[PDB]
Amino acid sequence: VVGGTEAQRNSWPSQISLQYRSGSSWAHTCGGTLIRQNWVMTAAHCVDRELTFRVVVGEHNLNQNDGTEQYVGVQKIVVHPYWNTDDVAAGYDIALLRLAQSVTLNSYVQLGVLPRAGTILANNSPCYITGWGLTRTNGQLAQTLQQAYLPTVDYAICSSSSYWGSTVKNSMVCAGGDGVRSGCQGDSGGPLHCLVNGQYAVHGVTSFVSRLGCNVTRKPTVFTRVSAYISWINNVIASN
Numbered sequence: 001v002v003g004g005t006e007a008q009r010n011s012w013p014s015q016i017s018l019q020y021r022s023g024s025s026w027a028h029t030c031g032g033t034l035i036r037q038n039w040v041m042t043a044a045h046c047v048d049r050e051l052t053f054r055v056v057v058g059e060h061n062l063n064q065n066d067g068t069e070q071y072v073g074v075q076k077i078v079v080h081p082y083w084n085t086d087d088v089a090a091g092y093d094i095a096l097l098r099l100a101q102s103v104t105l106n107s108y109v110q111l112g113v114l115p116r117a118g119t120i121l122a123n124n125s126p127c128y129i130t131g132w133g134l135t136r137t138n139g140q141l142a143q144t145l146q147q148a149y150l151p152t153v154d155y156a157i158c159s160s161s162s163y164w165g166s167t168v169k170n171s172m173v174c175a176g177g178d179g180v181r182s183g184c185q186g187d188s189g190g191p192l193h194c195l196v197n198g199q200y201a202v203h204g205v206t207s208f209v210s211r212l213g214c215n216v217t218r219k220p221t222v223f224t225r226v227s228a229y230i231s232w233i234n235n236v237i238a239s240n
């Protein structure tokens, strides 16, 4: 997250860190949203590589013991069947991860609430992106979970020439684009939290930014729109 502020430890308890094994260590690569005690929602592109993945819930500082972490292996990966890694613009950038264990809930670990199916936010609805992604274009991961305020940019504007043109689909949410604040690499897979009738819901799964840079004016961060996938999510969870 570029132009973020440090999140309070208990503000976003459904946020997870998706990490891959690297030698005797683990490295953060993406975010995710805990949606059942044993299921995480993330981006399909995050699990394109066939690595060993683990999920950390109750994570705040990637570099220090927070005293609240639960470390759980990824047991099963169900990527959206229409996803194509060489066509992120087509959308379908969503995957579910079944965890090896069911995590224990507490003020640092809660389920993310999802929007009602087919819900579309009005232009300029306020949202926060959260993540440990790069804090500058071509920078480094954050140590502590960041949040940044990114208002939505509706399909008509986001798909206009000055913005993302044909790259953006109605199955995506655009948010941000002020040139200061944005998602960035390593935020992929994580949530876009937006208020609806007084409650935050996870409306977006971070999918991509401009090749030009993370915080680029009129290149808002682009998210998979969760409310286009409610039936898909329920179907996977029901069969698995």
Ligand SMILES: [Br-]
Pocket (backbone or CB within 6 Å): 011, 012, 013, 014, 015, 111, 112
């Ligand atoms: Br949350």
Ligand SMILES: [Br-]
Pocket (backbone or CB within 6 Å): 021, 022, 023
């Ligand atoms: Br390795």
Ligand SMILES: [Br-]
Pocket (backbone or CB within 6 Å): 024, 025, 026, 027
């Ligand atoms: Br480690």
Ligand SMILES: [Br-]
Pocket (backbone or CB within 6 Å): 026, 027, 028, 062
């Ligand atoms: Br890390």
Ligand SMILES: [Br-]
Pocket (backbone or CB within 6 Å): 035, 036, 037, 038
């Ligand atoms: Br549950």
Ligand SMILES: [Br-]
Pocket (backbone or CB within 6 Å): 036, 037, 038, 102
């Ligand atoms: Br469970």
Ligand SMILES: [Br-]
Pocket (backbone or CB within 6 Å): 060, 061, 064, 144
């Ligand atoms: Br900290």
Ligand SMILES: [Br-]
Pocket (backbone or CB within 6 Å): 063, 143
């Ligand atoms: Br560090």
Ligand SMILES: [Br-]
Pocket (backbone or CB within 6 Å): 062, 063, 064, 065
């Ligand atoms: Br540590």
Ligand SMILES: [Br-]
Pocket (backbone or CB within 6 Å): 071, 072, 073, 074, 100, 101
């Ligand atoms: Br495990």
Ligand SMILES: [Br-]
Pocket (backbone or CB within 6 Å): 075, 076, 077, 078
């Ligand atoms: Br698998």
Ligand SMILES: [Br-]
Pocket (backbone or CB within 6 Å): 077, 078, 079, 080
């Ligand atoms: Br799969």
Ligand SMILES: [Br-]
Pocket (backbone or CB within 6 Å): 103, 104, 105
């Ligand atoms: Br529990």
Ligand SMILES: [Br-]
Pocket (backbone or CB within 6 Å): 106, 107, 108
């Ligand atoms: Br609690």
Ligand SMILES: [Br-]
Pocket (backbone or CB within 6 Å): 010, 107
């Ligand atoms: Br608390």
Ligand SMILES: [Br-]
Pocket (backbone or CB within 6 Å): 114, 115, 116, 119, 196, 201
């Ligand atoms: Br909703």
